[PDB]
UniProtKB/Swiss-Prot annotation, chain D:
Highest taxon in the source lineage: Eukaryota
Taxonomic source organism: Rattus norvegicus
Positions of modified residues (Phosphotyrosine): 6, 24, 76, 121
Assembly: The 26S proteasome consists of a 20S proteasome core and two 19S regulatory subunits. The 20S proteasome core is a barrel-shaped complex made of 28 subunits that are arranged in four stacked rings. The two outer rings are each formed by seven alpha subunits, and the two inner rings are formed by seven beta subunits. The proteolytic activity is exerted by three beta-subunits PSMB5, PSMB6 and PSMB7.
The protein, known as: Proteasome subunit alpha type-2
Principal subcellular localisation of the protein: cytoplasm
Positions carrying Phosphoserine: 7, 14, 16
Pfam families named in the record: Proteasome (PF00227), Proteasome_A_N (PF10584)
Family: Belongs to the peptidase T1A family.
Key words, A-Z: Acetylation, Cytoplasm, Nucleus, Phosphoprotein, Proteasome
Annotated gene: Psma2
UniProtKB/Swiss-Prot annotation, chain E:
GO MF annotations, alphabetized: ubiquitin protein ligase binding
Chain positions found as Phosphoserine: 243
PROSITE patterns registered for this protein in UniProt: PROTEASOME_ALPHA_1, PROTEASOME_ALPHA_2
Gene Ontology cellular component list: cytoplasm; nucleus; proteasome complex; proteasome core complex; proteasome core complex, alpha-subunit complex
Protein name: Proteasome subunit alpha type-3
Record's signal peptide: none
Curated annotation (Swiss-Prot), chain F:
Protein family membership: Belongs to the AAA ATPase family.
Protein name: 26S proteasome regulatory subunit 8
Intracellular or extracellular location(s): Cytoplasm; Nucleus
Protein function: Component of the 26S proteasome, a multiprotein complex involved in the ATP-dependent degradation of ubiquitinated proteins. This complex plays a key role in the maintenance of protein homeostasis by removing misfolded or damaged proteins, which could impair cellular functions, and by removing proteins whose functions are no longer required. Therefore, the proteasome participates in numerous cellular processes, including cell cycle progression, apoptosis, or DNA damage repair.
Taxon lineage: Eukaryota, Metazoa, Chordata, Craniata, Vertebrata
Coverage span on the entire protein: 349 to 406 of 406
Curated annotation (Swiss-Prot), chain G:
Modified residues (Phosphotyrosine): 159
Gene3D superfamilies, alphabetized: Glutamine Phosphoribosylpyrophosphate, subunit 1, domain 1 (3.60.20.10)
Post-translational modification N6-acetyllysine, affected residues: 102, 104
GO cellular component terms given for this protein: cytoplasm; myofibril; nuclear matrix; nucleus; P-body; proteasome complex; proteasome core complex; proteasome core complex, alpha-subunit complex
Quaternary assembly: The 26S proteasome consists of a 20S proteasome core and two 19S regulatory subunits. The 20S proteasome core is a barrel-shaped complex made of 28 subunits that are arranged in four stacked rings. The two outer rings are each formed by seven alpha subunits, and the two inner rings are formed by seven beta subunits. The proteolytic activity is exerted by three beta-subunits PSMB5, PSMB6 and PSMB7. Interacts with ALKBH4.
This protein's name: Proteasome subunit alpha type-6
Species this protein is from: Rattus norvegicus
């Protein structure tokens, strides 16, 4: 996660690695044809640069289930 | 070209051989392992969602011609 | 030619008698060389447009 | 209100012997625009410079010099938001005192009364200690009064004091030029010198305001007069 | 958002570097998780429709009330978590109740939507009480504006709508409303149509059964707000099932 | 009396500065008048740091 | 770091900080940009005009209902700029304050006085740790009962001052700069000219040029004290006028 003003620690190997995904991810270096299946329980901790539509185009929800959905699993 | 591996002899620096460009050991782990089927019917409920994932992920790769016909990226 | 060899440029030397054997072109880094040579993706001017 | 609320104090002492938030507040008054207040002993003059820096302010009303009532005036230092409550507060107090005495609030008395409310704001929770310093002027009972009210609550009665940008330099000039019981002309002149000490808030007439208290009440001065006093200082 | 270990998402009298409280956003997910409430503005009245999920087969209509009658001309249709919906219902009822009794005329909605949203928002500001994780609509027939429908979000923002849906498939429902002209159409036809959108939303492979509560405030009832008459209610559901297939 | 100081550096600087004024002027001695100009220079530099809320390190 | 550092509990609630203001207070300024609205305020000498972007995020809205222009009194009109959640809430608070004067005084409240009562109100929010400051600012227009048309704006932290020209928005500093050159070069102010300055300045910085249903213009003229909504036809009229200036 980028948000650093860290002069006290905070590694910044980790800073490079999130930034690098964007780099690969811009159109200049192809990524049109390859899909990335991204998964997170918390999108409540991420930033918009990594997420946000048209960088990872489709955004698929899975809301809580209901009785029929319970019915088929059982 | 730049990025290519090439061998060179230690005892006197001549090019031993030419090798093609290749990934780290960690990356080899990252490559395919494959996962087995839960089958669409068999993975219980969430019906509207089976459609959303199938359409997005697997179809543009496998059922590619229909997408080319749509004209989308 | 004495003129070819300068502070900026590179030379190759005998490892066994250190006389300048020959001249080599300037300093370069392999990462730089590929970045300059290549231009993938291209990118259309039209898109950024309207702004 | 429609919630539980707070009541815990945001200030805790130190084994230093200090209260932490008032020291941060003191930094904010210094970050202001120069405001000086001198009691001459032939009237009280409060002068300030106001950073507008565009003169797209059609103020014929609110300013950094605002009259509280007809023989009290107020000038601040620091930030504007904290001023807004204090100026309204002072007007209310002016009204409370007007009803019984019917001579609007005296300066010695005003400060004690503001000081008590300021102290609560530190002492209590769901409120916070100011970071404005007020300079209060008044002429009432045939004596001029000048007080300075600190963002903690403290009040000191001064002959001449400075606040706002480069106050340390201001207070030191004030001691040298001004000595106690000099004339109304000296008080005004040094007052405008402190603003000139360091300006940088657009040099046009409407960017300095002075308001003067004297025997006949309090009025704020037109920006054009203020400029004439400045013009002398190079 | 952030998941800081002291405040910001753990308080709500604290704004983020950008100026937003993460706590209202977590609450905004809650309307999405359960069933939809649709409500469209007519000009002879307003027609509301909330699908009430048959969770238990031993319930009767009036259970897990998503439809409230705010006054005798004001409705409230909610979507999202029912506990925050109840609070919002209680305030709305008292605000509407004083206005008919005292003034003697029907309430213009636009002010009412602003006041209730003020209530939502005042609580967001506070860290001592919570943002409301419901989205709800208010609908009224007036003699100063005619029909009005306003939708207030879990953030306390009010906008007027010709036709709204808040729930687990906003995108599918809004679009169906766009295609149709119900904006100035007669309330009677609308009853059938609002039910039919509920039918698309509902799945027989994500839900078993629902019980339709629609509410009239329109020309049948002569502008009186009642929960849908049993005959009409059935007629409208009957059409909804028949027309898909 | 005139300097309020702030450092041993400030004290030391009054002397060094008097040499810089004498050199400019091309004196072959250091005069009493030079020290007067120097303190005053040094003083002024202190005041700039005082305004900024700084010690001797920025 | 800065703008997110503990020094008391001042990056959480209002108390001063190392920055010489308040962190919590500064998020409340930062908050204005998020809403996405930008406003230009010009003070005429026959009217006082505010133009602000009207946030339209659906195609299922009725035009009349969806606005940010509010009638505070039959003398004062306003636009809300910043976060819309905070906008509805401040307006309802103001309204009680306007009404409170209204019975006592027996006449329409001055634009200066309306701004003074609300400004102080925004200060209570700011002084308190019980609630966070408003994410919005209310910018007032009105005919002052002798001074003339007046434009006052109260901050989201609540301080108010008078203006010839004001701007608040996403880009607060740049709009204000564009706006001083329009004042300097003085075309003079009639009903149409002053409205025209105001819209163009909002268009030039952001570099859009609008539809009449995505800007809103609100005036208080000396035709009558009552505040009016001009509606799309008259707003369109002003848009076309902007061409081939000055």
């Amino acid at each position: 996660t980028k948000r650093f003003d860290s002069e006290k620690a905070g590694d910044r190997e980790v800073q490079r690695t999130m930034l690098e995904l964007l780099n690969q991810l811009d159109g200049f270096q192809p990524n049109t044809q390859v899909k990335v299946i991204a998964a997170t329980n918390r999108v409540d901790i991420l930033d918009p640069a990594l997420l946000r539509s048209g960088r990872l185009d489709r955004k698929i929800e899975f809301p809580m289930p209901n009785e029929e959905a319970r019915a088929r699993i059982m | 070209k730049p990025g290519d591996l090439v061998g060179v002899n230690k005892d006197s620096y001549l090019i031993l051989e030419t090798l093609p460009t290749e990934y780290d050991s960690r990356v080899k782990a990252m490559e395919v392992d494959e996962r087995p089927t839960e089958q669409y019917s068999d993975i219980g409920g969430l019906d509207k969602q089976i459609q959303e994932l199938v359409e997005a992920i697997v179809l543009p790769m496998n059922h590619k011609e229909k997408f080319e016909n749509l004209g989308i990226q | 030619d004495k003129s070819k060899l300068k502070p900026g440029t590179r030379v190759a030397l005998d490892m066994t008698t250190l006389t300048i054997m020959r001249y080599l072109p300037r300093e370069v880094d392999p990462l730089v060389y590929n970045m300059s040579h290549e231009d993938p993706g291209n990118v259309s001017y039209s898109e950024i447009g309207g702004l | 209100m429609a919630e539980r609320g707070y009541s815990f104090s945001l200030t805790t002492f130190s084994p230093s012997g200090k209260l932490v938030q008032i020291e941060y507040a003191l930094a904010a008054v210094a970050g202001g625009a120069p405001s000086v207040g001198i009691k001459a002993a032939n009237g009280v003059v409060l002068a300030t410079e106001k950073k507008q820096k565009s003169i797209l302010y059609d103020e014929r009303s609110v300013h950094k010099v605002e009259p509280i009532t007809k023989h009290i005036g107020l000038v601040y230092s620091g930030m504007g938001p904290d001023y807004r409550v204090l100026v309204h507060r002072a007007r209310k107090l002016a009204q409370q005192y007007y009803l019984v005495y019917q001579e609007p609030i005296p300066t010695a008395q005003l400060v004690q009364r503001v000081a008590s409310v300021m102290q609560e704001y530190t002492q209590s929770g769901g409120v916070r200690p100011f970071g404005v310093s007020l300079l209060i002027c008044g002429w009432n009972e045939g004596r001029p009064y000048l007080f300075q009210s600190d963002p903690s609550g403290a009040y000191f009665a001064w002959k001449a004091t400075a606040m706002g940008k480069n106050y340390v330099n201001g207070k030191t000039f004030l001691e040298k030029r001004y000595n106690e019981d000099l004339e109304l002309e000296d008080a005004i002149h040094t007052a405008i010198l402190t603003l000139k000490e360091s300006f940088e808030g657009q040099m046009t007439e409407d960017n300095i305001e002075v308001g003067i208290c004297n025997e006949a009440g309090f009025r704020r001065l037109t920006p054009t007069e203020v400029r004439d006093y400045l013009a002398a200082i190079a | 958002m952030s998941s800081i270990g002291t405040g910001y998402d753990l308080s709500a009298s604290t704004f983020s570097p950008d100026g937003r409280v993460f706590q209202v956003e977590y609450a905004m997910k809650a309307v999405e998780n359960s069933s939809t409430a649709i409500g469209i503005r007519c000009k002879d009245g307003v027609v509301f429709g909330v699908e009430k999920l048959v969770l238990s087969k031993l319930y009767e209509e009036g259970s897990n009330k998503r439809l409230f009658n705010v006054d005798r001309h004001v409705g409230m249709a909610v979507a999202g978590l029912l506990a925050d919906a109840r609070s919002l219902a209680d305030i709305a009822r008292e605000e509407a109740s004083n206005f008919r009794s005292n003034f003697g005329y029907n309430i213009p909605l636009k002010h009412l939507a602003d006041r209730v949203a003020m209530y939502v928002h005042a609580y967001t500001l506070y860290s001592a009480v919570r943002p409301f994780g419901c989205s709800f609509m208010l609908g009224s027939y007036s003699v100063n504006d005619g029909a009005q429908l306003y939708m207030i979000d879990p953030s306390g923002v009010s906008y007027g709508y010709w036709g709204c849906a808040i729930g687990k498939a906003r995108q599918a429902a809004k679009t169906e409303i766009e295609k149709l002209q119900m904006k100035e159409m007669t309330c009677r036809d609308v009853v059938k149509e609002v039910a039919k959108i509920i039918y698309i939303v509902h799945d027989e492979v994500k839900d078993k059964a629902f019980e339709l509560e629609l509410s009239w405030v329109g020309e049948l009832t002569k502008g009186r707000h009642e929960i849908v008459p049993k005959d009409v209610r059935e007629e409208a559901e009957k059409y909804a099932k028949e027309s898909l297939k | 009396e005139l300097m309020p100081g702030a450092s041993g550096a400030e004290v030391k600087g009054v002397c060094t500065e008097a040499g810089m004024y004498a050199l400019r002027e091309r004196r072959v001695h250091v005069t009493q008048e030079d020290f007067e100009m120097a303190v005053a220079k040094v003083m002024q530099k202190d005041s700039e740091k005082n305004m900024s809320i700084k010690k001797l390190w920025k | 770091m800065s703008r997110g550092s503990s020094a008391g509990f001042d990056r959480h609630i209002t108390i001063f900080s190392p920055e010489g203001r308040l962190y919590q207070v500064e998020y409340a300024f930062k908050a204005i940009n998020q809403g996405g609205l930008t406003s230009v305020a010009v003070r005429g000498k026959d009217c006082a005009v505010i133009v602000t972007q009207k946030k339209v995020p659906d195609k299922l809205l009725d035009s009349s209902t969806v606005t940010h222009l509010f009638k505070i009194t039959e003398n004062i009109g306003c636009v809300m700029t910043g976060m819309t959640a905070d906008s509805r809430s401040q307006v309802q608070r103001a309204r009680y304050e306007a009404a409170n004067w209204k019975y006592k005084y027996g006449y329409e409240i001055p634009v200066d006085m309306l701004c003074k009562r609300i400004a102080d109100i925004s200060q209570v929010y700011t002084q308190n740790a019980e609630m966070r400051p408003l994410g919005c600012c209310m910018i007032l227009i009105g005919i002052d009962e002798e001074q003339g048309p007046q434009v006052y704006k109260c901050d989201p932290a609540g301080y108010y001052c008078g203006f010839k020209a004001t701007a608040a928005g996403v880009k607060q500093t740049e709009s204000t700069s564009f706006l001083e050159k329009k004042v300097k070069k003085k075309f003079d102010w009639t009903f149409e000219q002053t409205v025209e300055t105001a819209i163009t300045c909002l268009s030039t910085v952001l570099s859009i040029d609008f539809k009449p249903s995505e800007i809103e213009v609100g005036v208080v003229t000396v035709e009558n004290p009552k505040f009016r909504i001009l509606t799309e036809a008259e707003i369109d009229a002003h848009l076309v006028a902007l061409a081939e200036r000055d």
